[PDB]
Amino acid sequence: KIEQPRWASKDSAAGAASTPDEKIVLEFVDALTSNDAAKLIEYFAEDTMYQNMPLPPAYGRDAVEQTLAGLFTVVSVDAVETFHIGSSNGLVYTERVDVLRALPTGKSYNFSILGVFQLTEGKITGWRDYFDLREFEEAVDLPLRG
Ligand code: NA
C-alpha cells in the first residue's frame, strides 16, 4: 500500500480532473490494471505512438498493441496510484506510481512515473512515460532493445 508523498498538491489531485482529455487519460491509466491489451488498444488512434523512454518506440496501432500484449505475458500491473494530473497545449500529464509484479518470480516493484499523453478527437496520438529503468530489465522478462 502506497502513501501520499509530502509534495502532493491538492490543487492538481486526481479527483479534480476537469477537462475531457484529463478524464479520458485518468480512465486509461486506471484501466492498466486490467492487464488486457485488447481492451487497452481501443483507446488509441491508428496514427499513434508509445514509448518507455528511451527504449525503441512503437509507431502505429499494430506496434503499440503488440508491445502491450508482450508486457502482459511477463508482468502484472497490480496498482496505479495517480498523485497529479493536468494539461496544457494539447498535452496531458500524470504524476503517478505503478506497481508491477513479475509473473515468473512474484517479486513486486514500485515505479515512480511522469507520463505525457497527446489526444486527437479523444484518441491517443502519443504516450511517453519517464522513469528509472534500472529495475525494469529484471522486472520484465524480455530482452531490452535499448
Ligand atoms: Na483540476
Curated annotation (Swiss-Prot):
Induction: By growth on monoterpenes. Optimum pH is 7. Pfam families: LEH. The active site is at residues 98, 129. It is an enzyme of class 3 (hydrolase). Its EC number is 3.3.2.8. Optimum temperature is 50 degrees Celsius. Keywords: Hydrolase. Changing residue 52 to A: Almost no activity. SUPFAM superfamilies: NTF2-like (SSF54427). Pathway: Terpene metabolism; (4R)-limonene degradation; (1S,4R)-1-hydroxylimonen-2-one from (4R)-limonene: step 2/3. It catalyses: limonene 1,2-epoxide + H2O = limonene-1,2-diol. The keyword Transport does not apply. Catalyzes the conversion of limonene-1,2-epoxide to limonene-1,2-diol. Can use both the (-) and (+) isomers of limonene-1,2-epoxide as substrates and also has some activity with 1-methylcyclohexene oxide, cyclohexene oxide and indene oxide as substrates. Monomer. Belongs to the limonene-1,2-epoxide hydrolase family. This is Limonene-1,2-epoxide hydrolase. It comes from Rhodococcus erythropolis (Arthrobacter picolinophilus). The gene is limA.
